[PDB]
C-alpha cells in the first residue's frame, strides 16, 4: 500500500532579534534546505509589514510565505478600513 | 380572481387557460408535421420551415439547417413543433431522459415510455405556478422490443397517446379526415407487402398526406422525412433526392 | 421558505403591522401588576362560561421559572408560543451561567424576540403585550412591560390590555411604595375592577415573593370584592 503523506517539512534557518532603547535588530540567514540538500542559498526570511514593523520566521517555507503574505494583506486592509497603520502591539495580537 | 388566466390555476369553470394559450402558441408557428405507422416501420414528415416568430426568413438563412426533426437516440427520433427555444429544450430533456434510462436499466428506452416520462415532466409545469409552460408539441417514433413500430404524440398539456397516424399543425380535424381516408384506402388491400414495399408505401402515404393537408405542391428541398423500420431500426432521414423521387411518383399516378 | 417583508414603513413613517398588533393587544383582557418592597401582585381578568367552561385550564398568569412570572394581554396562541420560548431561554441562561436568569435579562430577551419578529421576512409580529415580575441579581423586585414593537420599561405599577388607560390613571393616584401584601392585593383588585365587572370569578390574582408564586384563594377574593362593593355603594 501507500503511506500517508506527511504535510510538514523543516526548511531550516535561524532568525535572531535584539531590542535596544530606541531600536530593534532582526537578523536571519538565507539558506533554504531540504533534508541534507540546499534548495537555494538565498531565501530571505524577513518580510516588511509596516514602516516600523517587520516579521521573521523559521520553519516550513511554504507556510512562512503564505503567513507573511496573509499578514501583509490583512494589514493593508486594516489601513484602508481604519485610516491608520497598526502599531506593533496590534499586529502582535492579530498574528 | 383577476389572475386566473395568468397562472396555472383553475378558473371558475375548471379550465387552466395557460395550457390553452400554450397550445395556441404551438398552433401559431404555422408548422405542420405528420407521422404515419406501417406494419414494420414508421415515418415522420415535417416542413423545413422556420416557425412564424418575431423575426422573419432572410435569403441569407441557411435553409439546410432549418429542421424540426431530431434524433433522441440512434433508434428514437421525433418532430418538435412550437417555439424553437422550447422545442430545443424538450429535445435536450428527452435526450437526457433516454440516456439516464439506458444507464440505470442497461437497455434502451422505447418510444412509448420516453413519451410518458416527458409528459410526467410537463405535468410539473402545468401544476407549479412559477414555471412557464413549454409551448411545444411533439411526435416520437421507434421500434419497440417486439419489432413493432410506435407512434406517440405529446402536447403542452402533458397528454400523450399512441396513434396509427397523427398531425401537428394549424388544422387537425381536416388533417384527421385526410389521414383516415388514406389509412382505410391503404388497409383495403389484401396483398401481403414486403419490408421494402411496406416502407415505400408508408413514406408515400406520409408525403401524400402532408401534401393533401398543406394544399400546395411540396418541394423536396422544403420538407424533411425520417424513417425507422425493422430493416433499419436507426432513426434516419432520407435524402432530398429520394424525397424528390417519391414526389415525382406521387404526382405521376 | 416564505421571506416577504410583512412589516414595512408606511409613507407616514410607521410600522402599520406593529400598530395592528397593538390593536390586537387592546382587544385582550386587562392585567395589572403592582410592585412593593420585596413582592409584587399580578392580577388579570377572567372570562369563562359558567358551568361549561373549565376555569383551571386557561392560564394568563404563568410562571416562567423559579423566580419570574408573566402576565399578558392580546392573542392567546401568540402568548403561548412566546412564553414557551421565554421558559426555554430561562433554562438556557441557567445552563450557560450556573445562575437563574434575572428578571431584567428576561424582559430584554422577550422584547428582543418581539422586535425581531417586526424585522424578519415572512413573519408577523406577536399580538401581545406582557408584564414580567421577578427579581434582579441584587434580589430587588422589578416589573417590566413589553410591547409588540419590542419596547420595554420598568414600572412601579402598570396595566396592559383593554382599557389600560383607565387603570393606569387610577394606579397613579392610589399607588404607594412599600405597601403590605393585603393592601397591595386590595389595590390590584380595585385597579382591575375599575374596568371589569365586579366579581370573584372575573379575576385571577397572584402574589410573587422570593419563595414562590402563590395565587390568592377564592374566598379571599370574594371577601375583598364585598369590601369593594361596600365602598362603592357607600361612595355613591
Amino acid at each position: 500500500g501507500f503511506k500517508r503523506w506527511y504535510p510538514y517539512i523543516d526548511n531550516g534557518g535561524t532568525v535572531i532579534g535584539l531590542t535596544g532603547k530606541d531600536y530593534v535588530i532582526l537578523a536571519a540567514d538565507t539558506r533554504l534546505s531540504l533534508s541534507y540538500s540546499i534548495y537555494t542559498r538565498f531565501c530571505p526570511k524577513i518580510s516588511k509589514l509596516t514602516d516600523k514593523c517587520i516579521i521573521g520566521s523559521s520553519g516550513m517555507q511554504s507556510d512562512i510565505k503564505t503567513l507573511h503574505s496573509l499578514l501583509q494583506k490583512k494589514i493593508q486592509l486594516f489601513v484602508l478600513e481604519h485610516s491608520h497603520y497598526p502599531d506593533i502591539h496590534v499586529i502582535a495580537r492579530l498574528l | 380572481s383577476m389572475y386566473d388566466r395568468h397562472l396555472t390555476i383553475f378558473s371558475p369553470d375548471g379550465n387552466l387557460y395557460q395550457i390553452e394559450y400554450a397550445i395556441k402558441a404551438v398552433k401559431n408557428t404555422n408548422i405542420t408535421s405528420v407521422g404515419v405507422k406501417g406494419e414494420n416501420c414508421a415515418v415522420i414528415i415535417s416542413q423545413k420551415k422556420m416557425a412564424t416568430q418575431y423575426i422573419s426568413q432572410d435569403k441569407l438563412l441557411d435553409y439546410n439547417n432549418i429542421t424540426n426533426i431530431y434524433n433522441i437516440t440512434d433508434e428514437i427520433g421525433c418532430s418538435m413543433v412550437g417555439m424553437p427555444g422550447d422545442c430545443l429544450s424538450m429535445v435536450y430533456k428527452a435526450r437526457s431522459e433516454a440516456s439516464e434510462f439506458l444507464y440505470s436499466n442497461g437497455y434502451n428506452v422505447n418510444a412509448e415510455t420516453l413519451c410518458r416520462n416527458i409528459c410526467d415532466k410537463i405535468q410539473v409545469y402545468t401544476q407549479h405556478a412559477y414555471m412557464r409552460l413549454h409551448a411545444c408539441s411533439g411526435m416520437i417514433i421507434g421500434i419497440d422490443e417486439n419489432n413493432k413500430p410506435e407512434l406517440f404524440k405529446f402536447d403542452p398539456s402533458g397528454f400523450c397517446a399512441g396513434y396509427r397516424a397523427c398531425v401537428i399543425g394549424n388544422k387537425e380535424q381536416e388533417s384527421i379526415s385526410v389521414l383516415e381516408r388514406l389509412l382505410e384506402k391503404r388497409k383495403k388491400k389484401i396483398q401481403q407487402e414486403t419490408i421494402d414495399e411496406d416502407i415505400r408505401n408508408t413514406t408515400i402515404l406520409a408525403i401524400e398526406a402532408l401534401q393533401t393537408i398543406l394544399a400546395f405542391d411540396l418541394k423536396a428541398s422544403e420538407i424533411e422525412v425520417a424513417i425507422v423500420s425493422t430493416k433499419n431500426r436507426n432513426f434516419t432521414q432520407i435524402s432530398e433526392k429520394e424525397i424528390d423521387n417519391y414526389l415525382t411518383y406521387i404526382a405521376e399516378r | 421558505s416564505y421571506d416577504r417583508a410583512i412589516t414595512v414603513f408606511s409613507p407616514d413613517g410607521h410600522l402599520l403591522q406593529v400598530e395592528h398588533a397593538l390593536e390586537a393587544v387592546k382587544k385582550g383582557g386587562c392585567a395589572v401588576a403592582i410592585k412593593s418592597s420585596n413582592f409584587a401582585v399580578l392580577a388579570v381578568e377572567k372570562k369563562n362560561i359558567p358551568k361549561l367552561q373549565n376555569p383551571k385550564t386557561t392560564e394568563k398568569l404563568i410562571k416562567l421559572d423559579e423566580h419570574n412570572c408573566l402576565a399578558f394581554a392580546g392573542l392567546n396562541a401568540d402568548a403561548r408560543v412566546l412564553v414557551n420560548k421565554t421558559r426555554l431561554e430561562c433554562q438556557r441562561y441557567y445552563l450557560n451561567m450556573d445562575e437563574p436568569a434575572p428578571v431584567d435579562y428576561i424582559a430584554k430577551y422577550v422584547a428582543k424576540v418581539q422586535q425581531k419578529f417586526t424585522h424578519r421576512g415572512g413573519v408577523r409580529p406577536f399580538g401581545i403585550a406582557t408584564l414580567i415580575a421577578g427579581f434582579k441579581n441584587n434580589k430587588e423586585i422589578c416589573i417590566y412591560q413589553t410591547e409588540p414593537s419590542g419596547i420595554y420599561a420598568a414600572w412601579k405599577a402598570q396595566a396592559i390590555g383593554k382599557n389600560a388607560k383607565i387603570v393606569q390613571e387610577f394606579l397613579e393616584k392610589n399607588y404607594q411604595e412599600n405597601m403590605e401584601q393585603k393592601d397591595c392585593i386590595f389595590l390590584a383588585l380595585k385597579a382591575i375592577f375599575e374596568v371589569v365587572e365586579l366579581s370573584s370569578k372575573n379575576v385571577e390574582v397572584a402574589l410573587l415573593t422570593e419563595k414562590d408564586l402563590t395565587f390568592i384563594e377564592e374566598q379571599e377574593i370574594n371577601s375583598m370584592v364585598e369590601l369593594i362593593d361596600q365602598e362603592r355603594t357607600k361612595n355613591n
Binding site: 485610516s83 | - | 414603513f9 422586535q115 424585522h119 420599561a153 414600572w155
Partner: protein
Amino acid sequence: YDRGVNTFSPEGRLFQVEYALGAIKLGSTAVGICVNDGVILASERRISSTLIEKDSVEKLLSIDDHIGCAMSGLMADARTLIDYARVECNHYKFIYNENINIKSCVELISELALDFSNLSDSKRKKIMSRPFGVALLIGGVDKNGPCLWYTEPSGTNTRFSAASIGSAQEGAELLLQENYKKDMTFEQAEILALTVLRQVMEDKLSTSNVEICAIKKSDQTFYKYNTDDISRIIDVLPSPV
C-alpha cells in the same frame, strides 16, 4: 403594500429609506457637542408617568468604554443597532488589542442598518427585512481625539462639531449653530448643551428630566452624570430670558 422594499422612486430614492427618514423625526431630543477637551451628549427623557422607573429608560447608551451614543426614532431598532455595535467593537478589541476608532464603529452600524438592501451575500446573508428607522449620535475619544458622528436610516454618516436629533432637532440645531465655538472649553460645552436642551424642552429643565454623559480626552472613558453634576450645570446656567 403594492411596492417591494427595494423599489426606486422615479427620482432615484428608495421609498422605504425615505419613509424611514420620517420616523427619526420622532422622540426625545438629544444634542451632541464635541470640543477639544471632550465630547458631551445630552438628552431629554420623556417620562410617561410617575409609575415608570427612571433608571430603566435611557437614551444615552455606552457602546464601549470610549464610545457613547444618543438615539432617536424607534427605540427597539436603536437597541438592536447598539447591541450589534457593542459586539462588533468588542470583537475588534479582541483581535487587535486596542480601542476601535469611532468612525469604524459608525461604518459598522451603517452597514448593519442598510443590510435590508440585499446588495451582496458576502459574510452573513440578509436578515433584516426593512430599514431600521433610527438616527444616532455617536461620540467618543480615539487616537484622533474627541469626535461626534451622526448616522441615519439612509446609511450616510456625517461628522459634526455639534449636532441634534429628535423632535426638536431644528430649533436645537439653530441654537447650536449660532453659539458653538471651536476653542470652547468643556464647561462651556456643558452650559451650551443644557441651555439648548432647556430652550427646546417642553418641560422645565431639572436634574430628573435631563441625562448627560461625556467622553473626556483626558481618560477616554465614557462617564454618566449623576444628580450632583447635573445640579452644578443647571445652577451655573444663564437666565431663561
